[PDB]
Amino acid sequence: MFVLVEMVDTVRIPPWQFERKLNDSIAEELNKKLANKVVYNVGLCICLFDITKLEDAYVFPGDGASHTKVHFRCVVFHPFLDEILIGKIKGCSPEGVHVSLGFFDDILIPPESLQQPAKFDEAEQVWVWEYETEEGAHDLYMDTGEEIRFRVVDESFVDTSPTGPSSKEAPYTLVGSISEPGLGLLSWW
Amino acid sequence: LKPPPLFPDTDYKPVPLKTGEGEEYMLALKQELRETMKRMPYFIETPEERQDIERYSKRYMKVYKEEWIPDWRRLPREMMPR
Amino acid sequence: RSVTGGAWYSDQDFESEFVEVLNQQCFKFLQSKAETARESKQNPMIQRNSSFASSHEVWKYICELGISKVELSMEDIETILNTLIYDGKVEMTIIAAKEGTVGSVDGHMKLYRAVNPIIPPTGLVRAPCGLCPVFDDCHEGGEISPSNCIYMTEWLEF
Amino acid sequence: KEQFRETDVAKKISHICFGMKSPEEMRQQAHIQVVSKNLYSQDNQHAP
Amino acid sequence: TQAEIKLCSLLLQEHFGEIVEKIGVHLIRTGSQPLRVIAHDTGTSLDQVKKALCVLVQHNLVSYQVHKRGVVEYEAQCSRVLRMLRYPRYIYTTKTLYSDTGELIVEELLLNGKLTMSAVVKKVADRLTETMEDGKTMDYAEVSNTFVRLADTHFVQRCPSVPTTENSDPGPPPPAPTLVINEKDMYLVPKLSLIGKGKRRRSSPIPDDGIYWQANLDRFHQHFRDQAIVSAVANRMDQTSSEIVRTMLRMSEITTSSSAPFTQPLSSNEIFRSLPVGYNISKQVLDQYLTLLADDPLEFVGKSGDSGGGMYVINLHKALASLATATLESVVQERFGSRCARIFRLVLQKKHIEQKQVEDFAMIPAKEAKDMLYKMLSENFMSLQEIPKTPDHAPSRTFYLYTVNILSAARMLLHRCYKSIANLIERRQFETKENKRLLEKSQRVEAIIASMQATGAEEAQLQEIEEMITAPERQQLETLKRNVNKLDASEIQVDETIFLLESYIECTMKRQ
Numbered sequence A: 001m002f003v004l005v006e007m008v009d010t011v012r013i014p015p016w017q018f019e020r021k022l023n024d025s026i027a028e029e030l031n032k033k034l035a036n037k038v039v040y041n042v043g044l045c046i047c048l049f050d051i052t053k054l055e056d057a058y059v060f061p062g063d064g065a066s067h068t069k070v071h072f073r074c075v076v077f078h079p080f081l082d083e084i085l086i087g088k089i090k091g092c093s094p095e096g097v098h099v100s101l102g103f104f105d106d107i108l109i110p111p112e113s114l115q116q117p118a119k120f121d122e123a124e125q126v127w128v129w130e131y132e133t134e135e136g137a138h139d140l141y142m143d144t145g146e147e148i149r150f151r152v153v154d155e156s157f158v159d160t161s162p163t164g165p166s167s168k169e170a171p172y173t174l175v176g177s178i179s180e181p182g183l184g185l186l187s188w189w
Numbered sequence B: 001l002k003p004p005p006l007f008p009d010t011d012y013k014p015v016p017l018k019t020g021e022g023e024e025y026m027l028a029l030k031q032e033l034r035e036t037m038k039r040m041p042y043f044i045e046t047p048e049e050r051q052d053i054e055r056y057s058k059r060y061m062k063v064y065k066e067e068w069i070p071d072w073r074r075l076p077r078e079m080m081p082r
Numbered sequence C: 001r002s003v004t005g006g007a008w009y010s011d012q013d014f015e016s017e018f019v020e021v022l023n024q025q026c027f028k029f030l031q032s033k034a035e036t037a038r039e040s041k042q043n044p045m046i047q048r049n050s051s052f053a054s055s056h057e058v059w060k061y062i063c064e065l066g067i068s069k070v071e072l073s074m075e076d077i078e079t080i081l082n083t084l085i086y087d088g089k090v091e092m093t094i095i096a097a098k099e100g101t102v103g104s105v106d107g108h109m110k111l112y113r114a115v116n117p118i119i120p121p122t123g124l125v126r127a128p129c130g131l132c133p134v135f136d137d138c139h140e141g142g143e144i145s146p147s148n149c150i151y152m153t154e155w156l157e158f
Numbered sequence D: 001k002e003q004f005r006e007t008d009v010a011k012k013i014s015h016i017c018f019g020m021k022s023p024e025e026m027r028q029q030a031h032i033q034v035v036s037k038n039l040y041s042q043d044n045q046h047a048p
Numbered sequence E: 001t002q003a004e005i006k007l008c009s010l011l012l013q014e015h016f017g018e019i020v021e022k023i024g025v026h027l028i029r030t031g032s033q034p035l036r037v038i039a040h041d042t043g044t045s046l047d048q049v050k051k052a053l054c055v056l057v058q059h060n061l062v063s064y065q066v067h068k069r070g071v072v073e074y075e076a077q078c079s080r081v082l083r084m085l086r087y088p089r090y091i092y093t094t095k096t097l098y099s100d101t102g103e104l105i106v107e108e109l110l111l112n113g114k115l116t117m118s119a120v121v122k123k124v125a126d127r128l129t130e131t132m133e134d135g136k137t138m139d140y141a142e143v144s145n146t147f148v149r150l151a152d153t154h155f156v157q158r159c160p161s162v163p164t165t166e167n168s169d170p171g172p173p174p175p176a177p178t179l180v181i182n183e184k185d186m187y188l189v190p191k192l193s194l195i196g197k198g199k200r201r202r203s204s205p206i207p208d209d210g211i212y213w214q215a216n217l218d219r220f221h222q223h224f225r226d227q228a229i230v231s232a233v234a235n236r237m238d239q240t241s242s243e244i245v246r247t248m249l250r251m252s253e254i255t256t257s258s259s260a261p262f263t264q265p266l267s268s269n270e271i272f273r274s275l276p277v278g279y280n281i282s283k284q285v286l287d288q289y290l291t292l293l294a295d296d297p298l299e300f301v302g303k304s305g306d307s308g309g310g311m312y313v314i315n316l317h318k319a320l321a322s323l324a325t326a327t328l329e330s331v332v333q334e335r336f337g338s339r340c341a342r343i344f345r346l347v348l349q350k351k352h353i354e355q356k357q358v359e360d361f362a363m364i365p366a367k368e369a370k371d372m373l374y375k376m377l378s379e380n381f382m383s384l385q386e387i388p389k390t391p392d393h394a395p396s397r398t399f400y401l402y403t404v405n406i407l408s409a410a411r412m413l414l415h416r417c418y419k420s421i422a423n424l425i426e427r428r429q430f431e432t433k434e435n436k437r438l439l440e441k442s443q444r445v446e447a448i449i450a451s452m453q454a455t456g457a458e459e460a461q462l463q464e465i466e467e468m469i470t471a472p473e474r475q476q477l478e479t480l481k482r483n484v485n486k487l488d489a490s491e492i493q494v495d496e497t498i499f500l501l502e503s504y505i506e507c508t509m510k511r512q
């Protein structure tokens, strides 16, 4: 699921920094600026991988800082479709089961993905399972459970940019699949 | 004070359309025509781009077609598609 | 041109309803006579001669049925007939005052007898855009953006 | 966790391109259509 | 010409696609220029520009010309991009004049743009195989017969050909092959004898090499002009008279030029011998019809001589002036009522008049005409000429004499129609793209239902598939479809107008 992407940016180093060697300061500043945030075309950023090249460090008039342009590589969470994944549950819903990878949580298993036999619960939100001969419609999925196996089947970016003159859902969502044998709770197999 | 609404009403109205078997055939022919423009080389779409991964399915579903060439004696010798 | 206005100026309106209904009556009656001519297709020379609806005879047809009790003799009738001769209800067949009854009086047969609408309506008129009072405006992305022309919206509905 | 956005949009002028405004754009820029000749409300509040 | 440029963009998008639209619009915007600057301006890969130009010249959309300093210039004509709208009409009248084989010939010819006889007849036969079944077959013989008949009757006209290399400019070739057009063989079909039974989609060297062909657009325009004239005549007097005028047009066409104001001389004797045997008409009856037609006060036809007893010549320029005038009356009447057309025509026939005369002579009440003339004047359908009373041309010292400039009038309607078709096209595209989600949702399940039907799968899918939300939306899909159909019918009728409006602005101009 992890992917590596190349980037470029301009970094301002405020003047009391000048003691420490530059490369370290730019690395810190980029991690500060970009870490733990999501880009509209490449997903969720983890941290920078390395810095490839550095231009000259100008000083613009009217300011003490030094501006530098940077070429750098950053590792980003961007799972592609049909990847097999293991992840804890985080909550049931009528429209599906929410799953969590710990650092990320916007995974939904819709009921169409669930196995045919089980369609709804006894009015309790904890999703139940059913099966033909054994498992007489009594297994159910705990809201955390184990790291169930599932395979991604859909994804989307949704924009959240401001609209109109100035003066909560995450911009990324995934859909998983559970139907195929060997998936779900490990105890089943 | 209030300016008029963006659509002021008009007393006259557009005259009823003429219809008939010939006109129906014109309409159907126009539709059929629209369909034809989507199934020959002259319908230049953007060349396919941006594969995600080395999906094993790539072996089978790949679209196969001969390279379109016009007869070259009618055109300048400058724009060969190779 | 005061109280006179042509004696049709009764009610100080040109008596619009009466002038228009009188013109419609003349038109329909001369249609009837030209229709006798057309139904007979009389030896075409005489077909068009009978399609010369004699407007002295029209003048005598319009004094009666109680229509033109008001001033009628030539002048006032001739001029209202002429009000009908200023459009596509008519076309030149007067041949001066000497051929026909005083030129069939201003040519009140001329081509009332027919001149069928040279051509039918026009797609332009039979379409919203062309009929839209507010033209111009309607710009790709704007208030009257053609993507809402209620005229169309309606023409679409109907 | 929210969509990243750049914080500094600062820039520098490089050219002035003079030109003309046609009716469509002139309407598109404007907010309202002034239609009344008068300056203030009849009441003593004198609100425009 | 901006509306027109919008039409070009729309029809390039609809026929060919984005990149082709982009190149075509930029070229029709900038004029004849060499390739390198086009590639620079567009900024795309020269491969795309090259491929698009090859496709465009294949359909004869664009044209390339050798130029000074050895560079090659590429150019397009705006008129040519305004023709595919007429292709339905072309196919209809050809199906009217020829069986479905001629229809297929013409369809293939226009869709390909240029093709030779052998391959077109082969492709027509192949595409006809699915039009007859139960062991029925066909040979290239009948298709060749229809093709040669079409070519003889001038609907089919030969494309240009190269000059011979070993005859002219031996050695390295020039930048462009500089094709030349030959007129004597324009209707001369080459010869073949091959015949082949078409393959019925069972899924299990050229004698006419280089002899390409393309439909004769001018013949179709002339033929349409003839049909319009006949239709005017049929409505004018009678079906018999139009059958007569359809006659004088027949012997006129084979020898008359399309551009002259007047046809070649015709005699009633040759009209009569050409007159159908199925009509019970005598020579004297024809002579009477011709004399009274020539006596028509709209001067549809004139005498112009006495050769052969009956001698008559149709007046093209004057008629089209009448054709156009009438449609001007038409647009006025509906959009402004009969009384308004009553005044407009009055002002036309009275070359110079004033309002008080109009009210007196148009039976219009005061305070009802004045505003209406102002409306016509505001709309520029009426042009004020304004002779003065004094040289300062002060409004207090002038007469408001009205005047009509028919040629200018037509031009704005052309502009109107251009915007009109543009706005229809956009709305249809807008409707298509908004409903595309439900369209594809329906199409996938229709494909699922149509799939594996012959494989013998169980019938427990017709109702099960239908259980979804699409079913109570089919009536909305039908509403969509009729809206599209109904927009298209509107487009169609507008083209029929365009033909007459364009026919006049062409005929009224001398192009000197």
Ligand code: SF4
Pocket: C128, C129, C130, C131, C132, C133, C134, C135, C136, C137, C138, C144, C146, C149, C151, C152, E423
């Ligand atoms: S407002 Fe709409 S209907 Fe009127 S002219 Fe403009 S596009 Fe056509």
